[PDB]
């Protein structure tokens, strides 16, 4: 009878997560490229990584920023610090109220305004600026499941 009871009995598993975390940055660069590589080619473990290991897209922990609660992928060229930080990524305003995002260090080079829209001078000269600082206010969180 005990076997019949335990055949269709529920194993209840509660899980609790406790943790405090604060992070302040101004560019959200990547730090995983500083840590020693293990003998099997994987970077050593730290408490600051954003993760992101993917074998389908070839992503690695070194391709993503590690500060704030953002995992902003690192940008090549002069937008990012030549593959070391996040891109500048101005924003562009349009007459019809729509907006788009230019990814470059010089907004004058925005060679693709779509045919029917015009840059309304709403930003500095119609070109805004996506803020580069990320912040995670200090807070300890308890997660129950």
């Amino acid at each position: 009878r005990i076997a019949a009871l335990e055949r269709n009995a529920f194993s209840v598993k509660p899980s609790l997560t406790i943790g405090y975390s604060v992070s302040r940055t101004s560019r959200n660069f990547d730090v995983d490229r500083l840590f020693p590589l293990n003998a099997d080619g994987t970077v050593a473990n730290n408490a600051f990584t954003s993760g992101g290991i993917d074998t389908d897209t070839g992503a690695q922990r070194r391709d993503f920023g590690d500060f704030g609660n953002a995992s902003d992928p690192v940008v090549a060229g002069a937008a990012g610090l030549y593959g070391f930080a996040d891109g500048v990524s101005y924003t562009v305003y349009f007459t019809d109220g729509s907006t788009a995002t230019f990814d470059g260090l010089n907004p004058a080079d925005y060679k693709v305004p779509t045919g029917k829209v015009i840059d309304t001078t709403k930003g500095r000269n119609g070109f805004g600026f996506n803020n580069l600082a990320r912040y995670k206010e200090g807070s300890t969180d308890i997660g129950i499941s």
């Binding site: 560019r27 020693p36 590589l37 293990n38 080619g41 090549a76 500048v88 580069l132």
Partner: protein, 729 residues
């Protein structure tokens, strides 16, 4: 909401359908402080096949039936075709005929199950039968029939282009009989391609290959399968085949998911074996490539990078090929042949590759000689002398002699003189042409090692040309990459010598030590394309690697060097050094606190003389760190780690989104990255405090400090503090 099983454009965000299930956006609460969450019934069902019957008859019912009669007919595994049933009958116990192991398979199904109109699997049903015996030792002989067609609700209201009916016959003779190993296959297409007047189309696919077939149905051209003698007179056939794949045999003709096309068009292009899509197909349906010239008229269209856009026209395949090797005593010889015409038989698509080699080995000396040809009248996409991709006839004639001596102490020396000759001109490098055939088959150094193994050893006794590395320093701080095993895999009209040493060989001078000093000279034409030229290029390289464990520490030294004068593959011309040290101690159970030290130093220097500058590109990575395993209170651990990476004109390119990863490289960006950082990690019993401060600055030559790109002359900074605690109920 579509049944496709994939998240389409903005479906539900299920957490948004059932508010309170998760996240912070919605939380179903109570004023008293209670929190309510919906309870869902989760289930994963991986079983989709049900089999009935025990020995003789087994009937399988299910979705996405994976079945496989034979290659070129129902290579339908690896996805399955549709929903239905599959009966298998085993007559391995019939009284009169049970030693021949007869087997009868019968498949029926509906393609893709139930699916909407305008999909390829609407109202299409497939049926098939196969009969198999083993009259002799292992030769399975089988005959099979396979039809796939449209019913009255598919002939109308289907669109697509799925043929009205397709009907395939076949026969196969795979197996090993009397020390020989046959592999034959036949087929017949009979496609009725919808439309109105039908005009049934016929296509055949026959081959008779005598070789060794591995269990994954790939062909092993390194095991003889004939072996007409012992180790003193040991003539051994390796392959003897014939091909008659017609132009119209695609994955629709023989009713399969994928395949019947060249796998690479740059590697062996006669073989259709595709491990990616599960296409077992020993021979390919070749195609005729040509210039596009679509929009503008007068010039051939090219992509953005410069590679040529080509138009492909299926021609089929017809030809034979033989590979054998006669193992004498101290000497051994071998040869191969192959001629892949089109199906029609025109010599406007012939690709003939001949060759042969001979190795004489005795005591501690070995001397090889190899001659390789490739006379291809098929177009072929390859770079010309200048460096622009072109499409046209190719004619390569290579010959190389190598001399390897192994003193016995783990040492080895080797001299080589390789001479490539593309289209008459002496051609500082073959442009990948020699790898267009599946029978390359060079020999191997060492005595008592007479194996005629496929693949030209053009990556043997040559230098390295890798300019990409995982870590900031030149791949020398990576304990997973052996720099001394970095070869170029590109055949050169060169000549040179290479000493060396190995540490896994017993009776070595130094136990686990490796180095690869070497010198070589590469032929270059005079100007760009002239027949005249001189062996004026010079490559001088050498790498080293040494682990050891001196005491409690684990040292690891590595180093590299290269002093080329020419653009070899992608490496620019200049001196290139790199040195790396990785120290890793273990806990010291004598000194108090039981510390556990660490360390890492790496220096890299490269003087790139590119066609637009002579810039120096160097980098330096350092790293320390001490972990005290017993700090005052019991179960208290502290740990600190300082890192750092300085770099002149070097850059990092992230992952491309495909399998390719990111890598560091040399650019002419006049910027000096100075990534830094300190990382403190203390731990009480199980409560971990992690503090970390990092700074990134990229000054240009002037010192403008472009980091923190609001352009205020300040480095980018980051800082983090985490208190972590893992609890278990």
């Amino acid at each position: 909401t579509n049944g496709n099983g994939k998240k389409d454009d903005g479906e539900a965000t299920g957490r948004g359908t059932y508010l309170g299930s998760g996240g912070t956006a919605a939380i179903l609460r109570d004023p008293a402080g209670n929190v309510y969450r919906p309870v869902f019934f989760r289930f994963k069902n991986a079983t989709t096949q049900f089999s009935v019957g025990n020995n003789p008859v087994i009937v399988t019912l299910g979705q996405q039936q994976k079945f496989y009669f034979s290659d070129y007919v129902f290579d339908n595994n690896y996805d399955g075709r549709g929903d239905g049933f599959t009966v298998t009958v085993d007559g391995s116990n019939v009284p009169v005929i049970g030693a021949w192991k007869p087997q009868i398979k019968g498949v029926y199904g509906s393609r893709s199950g139930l699916d909407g109109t305008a999909e390829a699997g609407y109202g299409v049903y497939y049926r098939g039968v196969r009969a198999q015996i083993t009259p002799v030792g292992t030769l399975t002989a089988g005959i099979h029939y396979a039809q796939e067609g449209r019913d009255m609700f598919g002939a109308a209201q289907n669109t697509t282009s799925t043929p009205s009916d397709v009907t395939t016959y076949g026969a196969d003779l795979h197996g090993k009989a009397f020390g020989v190993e046959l592999h034959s296959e036949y087929a017949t297409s009979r496609v009725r391609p919808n439309t109105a007047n039908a005009a049934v189309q016929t296509s055949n696919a026959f081959y008779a290959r005598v070789a060794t077939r591995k269990d994954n149905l790939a062909f092993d051209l390194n095991t003889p399968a004939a072996k007409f003698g012992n180790d003193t007179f040991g003539v051994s056939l390796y392959d003897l085949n014939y091909r008659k794949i017609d132009a119209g045999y695609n994955n629709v003709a023989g009713i399969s998911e994928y395949g019947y096309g060249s796998y690479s068009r740059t590697s062996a292009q006669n073989i259709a074996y595709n491990p990616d899509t599960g296409v077992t197909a020993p021979f390919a349906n070749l195609d005729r490539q040509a210039y596009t010239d679509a929009n503008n008229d007068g010039t051939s269209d090219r992509n953005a990078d410069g590679t040529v856009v080509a138009t492909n026209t299926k021609i089929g395949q017809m030809g034979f090929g033989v590979k054998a090797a006669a193992n004498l005593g101290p000497v051994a010889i071998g040869g191969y042949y192959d001629t892949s015409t089109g199906a029609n038989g025109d010599n406007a698509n012939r690709m003939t590759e001949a060759g042969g080699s001979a190795k004489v080995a005795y005591s501690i000396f070995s001397l090889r000689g190899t001659y390789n040809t490739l006379d291809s009248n098929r177009p072929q996409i390859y770079r010309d002398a200048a460096g622009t991709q072109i499409i046209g006839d190719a004619k390569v004639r290579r010959y190389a002699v190598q001399a390897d001596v192994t003193p016995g102490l783990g040492l080895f020396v080797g001299a080589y003189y390789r001479d490539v000759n593309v289209n008459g001109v002496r051609s500082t490098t073959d442009r990948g042409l020699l790898g267009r055939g599946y029978l390359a088959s060079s020999f191997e150094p060492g005595v008592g090692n007479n194996a005629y193994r496929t693949g030209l050893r053009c990556a043997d006794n040559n230098f390295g040309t890798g300019t990409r590395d995982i870590d900031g320093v030149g791949g020398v701080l990576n304990p997973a990459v052996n720099l001394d095993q970095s070869r170029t895999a590109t055949c050169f009209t060169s000549y040179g010598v290479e000493a060396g040493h190995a540490g896994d060989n017993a009776n070595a001078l130094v136990k686990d030590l490796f180095f690869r000093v070497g010198y070589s000279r590469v032929y270059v034409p005079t100007t760009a394309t002239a027949t005249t030229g001189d062996f004026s290029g010079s490559v001088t390289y050498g790498d080293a690697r040494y682990d050891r464990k001196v005491g409690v520490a684990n040292v690891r030294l590595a180093g590299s060097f290269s002093t080329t004068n020419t653009q070899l593959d992608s490496r620019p011309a200049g001196t290139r050094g790199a040195v790396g040290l990785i120290v890793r101690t273990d806990p010291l159970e004598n000194v108090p606190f039981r510390p556990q030290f660490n360390g890492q130093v790496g220096y890299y220097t490269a003087d790139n003389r590119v066609a637009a500058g002579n810039y120096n590109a160097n980098a330096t990575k350092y790293g320390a760190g001490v972990v005290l395993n017993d700090f005052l209170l019991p179960q208290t651990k502290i740990g600190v780690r300082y890192d750092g990476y300085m770099a002149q004109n070097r850059q990092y390119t992230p992952f491309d989104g495909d399998g390719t990863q990111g890598y560091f490289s040399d650019a002419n960006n006049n910027r000096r990255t100075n990534l830094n950082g300190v990382y403190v990690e203390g731990a009480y019993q199980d409560l971990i405090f992690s503090y970390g401060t990092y700074t990134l600055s990229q000054k240009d030559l002037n010192g403008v400090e472009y980091g923190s790109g609001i352009n205020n002359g300040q480095p980018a900074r980051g800082q983090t503090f985490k208190i972590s605690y893992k609890v278990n109920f």
